[PDB]
Design a protein around this nucleic acid. Structure first.
Ligand SMILES: Nc1ncnc2c1ncn2[C@@H]1O[C@H](C[C@@H](N)CC[C@H](N)C(=O)O)[C@@H](O)[C@H]1O
Ligand SMILES: [Zn+2]
Ligand SMILES: [Zn+2]
Ligand SMILES: [Zn+2]
Lengths: 104, 218, 94, 78, 109, 95, 109, 79, 97
DNA sequence: ACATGCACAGGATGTATATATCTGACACGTGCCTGGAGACTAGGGAGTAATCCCCTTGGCGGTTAAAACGCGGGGGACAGCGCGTACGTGCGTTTAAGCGGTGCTAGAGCTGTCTACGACCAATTGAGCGGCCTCGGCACCGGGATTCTCCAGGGCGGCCGCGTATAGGGTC
DNA sequence: GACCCTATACGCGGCCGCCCTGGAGAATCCCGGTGCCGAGGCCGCTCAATTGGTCGTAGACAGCTCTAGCACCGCTTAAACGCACGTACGCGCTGTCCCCCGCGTTTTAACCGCCAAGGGGATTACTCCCTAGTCTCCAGGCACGTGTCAGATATATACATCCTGTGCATGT
């Protein structure tokens, strides 16, 4: 005389992660929100010249470039992690990737 | 005598203001298996849909009809029958041996919301209903195999089970399938751990009979 | 309300020549414009440097050919050289 | 604090498209720094171009030129 | 005169030989531009465009689409070794990436 | 017969004697300095050249050279190079 | 007429404004070269040369040599941050490397 | 003519030492010979292209310098 | 019977070769290698001495930079030894093949 | 005589597909007008020939540094295990992005005018380049002085075994 | 109730890990000669920079239009955020064993120096044809407009398997 729902086993850790990997490697959308990225862009630009204006295509181009940069960087840092016999990427992996690339 | 009558349905039936999320055939995942493979999208192969609890689609899967990963829509339930249990009601026993990992069945019922679920539980308390078939598929959606369901609703809880519930995504929506966790020879009654049943009530005793039985449902 | 030159019509002509029943999106056409301008600038710049290295005032087909060999990788270079030399052979005899 | 607008979910999505399964919790802040560097450089050069043309508005071509100047040619904006 | 005849036609090309000639002249690459240089360059540009467009059309057909979109250009470029090498340091807007998961991240038995 | 090959050797040596009066320089180091001056000349000249083409100009002026300095040089190098070149231009036109 | 006055002397430079002007004119950078462009560029080249040579002379002094060799230019360039950004992709013949050993390779105490 | 074997193991060890490398696996020598051969092939290909364009039968130092520069490995000290 | 411990002569050599500015490959072997690589591009080529010297300088600089990146890769994997997979990771991240 | 086992004509809705309607996305069609094309000329860049005369190639011989080879052994790579916590999965709330619509104005983008800057040319002349010579900075050698690494034996902190002191328990 | 049997931690060295120097080579520096060859300083000359003047057009400057960039507001709702939970992954520790380093001996081939020889790069002299410049003229390509034709797409009507309920055959 109790009732109460049953609960299926949650997905094993790493299954929704792989689902997301496939999903976001299938799509071409922009993965950052647009207003936050635009606010960050204007804030960064305030240091170089005040009262600047931006074309919408300027901010969209910036977002495309930055997102592509971060995706490629994450590919290289995942290679670093896997080299170190891991599957978790850590800040040291980003630092090794950027040092070998030439940025650091 | 016989179990109380229920509309033996085959696919999930929505009810109330619940709503499914069925995607178009273009946006369902496609694996890399090939129709010439040893067992395309087979159980033991490296199917990228099977690994991720995705169900292949014959009109999307590159293996075409050689895809052994359509176990939900084709309903390859191994044959089974219903037997009254000791002090739990009616369980089910299959017709053959089952090797560990064989898709045993699919849980299916009526799709209800949270407030409708608590309404049904209240109505059950009003008439001291003791058999509950709820199973939360996600927030705002619960399966209720009480009025409508299949043979799977006749599997009992056991603290040391031989089957389990796993969520797959078929045609872009979640479905729950009972899988075999150990090599079950026939004659053995099938039972999976409900894995929770206590909402706010007195924790009905668990007469499962397992060595590590928790006594109650928890 | 002013003219804006583009490679769109020529890209579309080449498209109908190889995939007669396939279209192309406006965004993809823009990407093809950028691609043609990029490759044009690469080849023209490399040929311009080639003239200056040898102290010549003229960008000729010979230097365009050598600029193609430096910039294109392998089979692309071979087929581009063959195609261009066929175009120049055909042009000079007409 | 607009760099905090590059939220954790956004960075996780960018990691997914890069094929990253597990993500250490120290990544996020680190990644923000990386982003804020890259952006700066590009925007710096973009504004430089914008100032040389005596415009108050940063044009998509300024961004494209900055990116190409940095060896990150971008197709699709001019 | 004698019925102007559009040098691209004389070369058997689709790309504009005359416009390429003018861009070479007005672009400060050398103080003289040969006669066959624009013909050669227009032929090479047309060839590379045809190569990319063929691969992209094949890719767009693999998805059962009849329009080429940036995704298909990206797929064609990354899936072809030499086109990948030519356009390695290039980013295609709205392109995405190749689907690729490392073999160690896949679930094990 | 023997043609004249130009180089920045005498100017590099003149600049060296300003900043280190009692210091010489090997022929190989002078060759490296020649390559360095030619490389930097080509970078600035090309950047200003295409910077004029972007704006649909035909004249390479001190504004083009200045902007090509800011694009190519980092930080303090850019600041000091800009100030030095501005000084040389503003003192060139008063004579 | 006036005797002569090289434009470097007018600008107060050691680098040749006239030769830089000719190189700008004969390099196909634009069809016109302003009066102040060679002056500005000669000043900037002179500044960069002076910066590198200052650091290289310091490096030569630190090695008890009174004559700059490629090793000292390399040391000056790699030890300075700005010159290292500028010349990050440049190889210097007979320059060698900075003396760097990673801390993990040193003998454990 | 196995001329790539003339880039001997001790020479590779010296190049590794100047790179800061303390201990070296014995499989590094063939890998490094392959890497070196690939790099050399690219540079010599471009240098011979420059040479043939100038109608010369002699590869000059400037051809190598131009090839390196166009591959992004600018080399000071040879012109 | 005196003998240094395994890793001190390696550090000695590291210091000796990071102090020197000289070519570490022999001359004639590298020259023959360059000629045999160039045979497959055009026959009967000549080579200015400065050409082969510039090639050697560039190749040595390339390999030294590559070994630095390889050593960083090995240290990342908590090793001290460099192995072929480290060279491969360095070259993959750089952009090479 | 009768209700058990179980069915067959009608309903009834999922099931499969024809069908009227949108919403763009391009698809031809004008309408211009600007920029290629034809035609012709002038002159300079490039091609060819001849000639010199560096500098690359090839040979020879000796010296000796360096590579090749062998071998012991030490330490690092690498496999295995255990644990504990950090990260992934999911839920319930909250927030802020995105969308749409409105409204205003900075400033991009263009035109018109005119001027003052840069190309160009001729004459002039001094700066910079090739050639040549010398003397000091550096490379090399050699012997002595530190300096650094390595390992063999002593003190210096253990816990550790063993005989031993202290007190509980059974018995007269 | 005291006396003797008996157990159990107490301390008393009892060897031990394990630093700590001390000294022996080995390597590296350091300093004085020694000589040699290249930096650097000068000379002569030539050719490129400077002076001057002319002329044309690039661009600066003013002015105008109207695009599109920004500011704001309200609603929807998806996404972000914070927390709970539980496992699987990172990381530390251990052992083992193999492979690479350090060093000695042998072998080989790089390197150095010297000498020819001839190939081919560099230079010069002509010359001739190919490109810029120009002027005229027309059509190719771009801007804008509207048709057409899809996919998509919600509407709607017939078909296929299931559901029904009282009646057909029957064992009581
Ligand atoms: N191990 C068990 N012991 C006792 N009762 C059980 C057990 N498992 C399930 N039940 C009862 O069965 C209900 C669960 C339902 N799925 C019914 C399953 C049951 N076999 C039936 O179909 O009737 C619960 O309300 C319990 O009262
Ligand atoms: Zn499959
Ligand atoms: Zn399948
Ligand atoms: Zn139980």
């Amino acid at each position: 005389a109790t009732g109460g729902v049953m609960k299926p086993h949650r997905y094993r850790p790493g299954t929704v992660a792989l689902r997301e990997i496939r999903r976001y490697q299938k799509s071409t959308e922009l993965l950052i929100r647009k207003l936050p990225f635009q606010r960050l862009v204007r804030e960064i630009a305030q240091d170089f010249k005040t009262d600047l204006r931006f074309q919408s295509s300027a901010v969209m181009a910036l977002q495309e470039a930055c997102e592509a940069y971060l995706v490629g960087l994450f590919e290289d840092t995942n290679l670093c992690a896997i080299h170190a016999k891991r599957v978790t990427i850590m800040p040291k992996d980003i630092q090794l990737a950027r040092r070998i690339r030439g940025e650091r | 005598r016989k179990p109380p009558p229920y509309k033996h349905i085959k696919v999930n039936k929505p009810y109330g203001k619940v709503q499914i999320y069925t995607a178009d055939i273009s946006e369902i995942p496609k694996c890399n298996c090939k129709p010439t493979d040893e067992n395309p999208c087979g159980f033991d192969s490296e199917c990228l849909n099977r690994m991720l609890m995705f169900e292949c689609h014959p009109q999307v899967c590159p293996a075409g009809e050689f895809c052994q990963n359509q176990c939900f829509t084709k309903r390859q339930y191994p044959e089974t029958k219903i037997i009254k249990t000791d002090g739990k009601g009616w369980g089910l026993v299959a017709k053959r041996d089952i090797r560990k990992g064989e898709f045993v069945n699919e849980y299916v019922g009526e799709l209800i919301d949270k407030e409708e679920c608590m309404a049904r539980i209240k109505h059950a308390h009003e008439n001291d209903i003791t058999h509950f078939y709820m199973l939360t598929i996600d927030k705002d959606r619960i399966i209720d195999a009480g009025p409508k369901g299949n043979y799977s609703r006749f599997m009992n809880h056991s603290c040391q089970p031989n089957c389990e519930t796993l969520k797959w995504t078929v045609n872009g929506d979640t479905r729950v399938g009972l899988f075999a966790v150990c090599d079950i020879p026939a004659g053995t009654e099938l039972t999976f751990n409900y894995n929770l049943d206590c909402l706010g009530n007195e924790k009905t005793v668990c007469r499962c009979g397992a060595s590590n039985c928790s006594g109650f449902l928890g | 309300r002013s003219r804006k030159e583009s490679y769109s019509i020529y890209v579309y002509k080449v498209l109908k020549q190889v995939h007669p029943d396939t279209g192309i999106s406006s965004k993809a056409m823009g990407i093809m414009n950028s691609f043609v301008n990029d490759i044009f600038e690469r080849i023209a710049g490399e040929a311009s440097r080639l003239a200056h290295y040898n102290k010549r005032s003229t960008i000729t087909s010979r230097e365009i050919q050598t600029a193609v060999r430096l910039l294109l990788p392998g089979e692309l270079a071979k087929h581009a050289v063959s195609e261009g030399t066929k175009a120049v052979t055909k042009y000079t005899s007409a | 604090d607009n760099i905090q607008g590059i939220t954790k979910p956004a960075i996780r999505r960018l990691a997914r498209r890069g094929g990253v399964k597990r993500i250490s919790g120290l990544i996020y802040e680190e990644t923000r720094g990386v982003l804020k560097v890259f952006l700066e450089n590009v925007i710096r050069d973009a504004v430089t171009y914008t100032e040389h043309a005596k415009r108050k508005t940063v044009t998509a071509m300024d961004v494209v030129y900055a990116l190409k100047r940095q060896g990150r040619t971008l197709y699709g904006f001019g | 005169r004698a019925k102007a005849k559009t040098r691209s036609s004389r070369a058997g090309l689709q790309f504009p030989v005359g416009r390429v000639h003018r861009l070479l002249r007005k672009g400060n690459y050398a103080e003289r531009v040969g006669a066959g240089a624009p013909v050669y360059l227009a032929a090479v540009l047309e060839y590379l465009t045809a190569e990319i467009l063929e691969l992209a059309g094949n890719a767009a057909r693999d998805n059962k689409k009849t329009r080429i979109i940036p995704r298909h250009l990206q797929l064609a470029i990354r899936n072809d070794e030499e086109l990948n090498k030519l356009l390695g340091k290039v980013t295609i807007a709205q392109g995405g990436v190749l689907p690729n998961i490392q073999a160690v991240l896949l679930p094990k038995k």
